Amino acid sequence: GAPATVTEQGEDITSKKDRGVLKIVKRVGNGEETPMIGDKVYVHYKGKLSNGKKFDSSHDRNEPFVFSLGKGQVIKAWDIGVATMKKGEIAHLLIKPEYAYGSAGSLPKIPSNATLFFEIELLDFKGE
Numbered sequence: 620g621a622p623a624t625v626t627e628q629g630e631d632i633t634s635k636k637d638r639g640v641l642k643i644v645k646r647v648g649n650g651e652e653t654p655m656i657g658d659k660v661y662v663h664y665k666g667k668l669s670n671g672k673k674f675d676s677s678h679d680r681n682e683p684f685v686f687s688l689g690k691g692q693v694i695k696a697w698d699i700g701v702a703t704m705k706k707g708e709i710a711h712l713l714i715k716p717e718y719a720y721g722s723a724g725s726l727p728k729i730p731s732n733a734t735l736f737f738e739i740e741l742l743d744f745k746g747e
């Protein structure tokens with residue numbers, strides 16, 4: 620599946636090189652610019668537990684998910700991963716618990732020590 624392909628072929632985009640956040644680019648974006656901390660970022664995404672037991676989609680709102688990068692509005696893996704993406708890019712991320720919800724988890728929706736998978740489309744980003 621997509622998660623196994625990321626485990627085997629995905630690029631380790633963590634500073635520590637601890638394989639906590641693995642990325643495959645699925646569709647190449649436009650320009651060389653990736654967003655800065657503070658930037659308002661617009662995405663579509665699908666996400667799941669790597670077990671597949673809970674599935675979440677911005678598409679089911681029919682509206683993009685918007686957040687400010689690097690302000691801890693999202694799990695650490697998103698601040699790291701979306702920061703590497705270009706306008707128009709689609710990427711897959713596989714995420715160890717340390718860069719998501721950790722040992723505590725986020726019950727009842729996310730269990731302790733959960734690995735997460737996302738597909739993310741970067742639609743746009745705009746300066747603060």
Ligand SMILES: COc1cc2cc(c1OC)O[C@H](C)CCn1cc(nn1)CCCOC(=O)[C@@H]1CCCCN1C(=O)[C@H]2C1CCCCC1
Pocket residue numbers: 664666667668673674675684692693694697725728729735
């Ligand atoms: C732990 O709680 C949730 C996790 C996730 C979705 C959740 C959620 O309930 C708050 O439903 C919301 C209704 C969706 C809108 N949204 C985004 C965030 N907060 N709300 C941003 C903060 C929390 O989410 C995250 O940081 C990540 C990245 C951004 C998209 C959503 N994220 C998730 O972790 C999903 C999660 C993915 C795996 C399957 C279960 C849902």
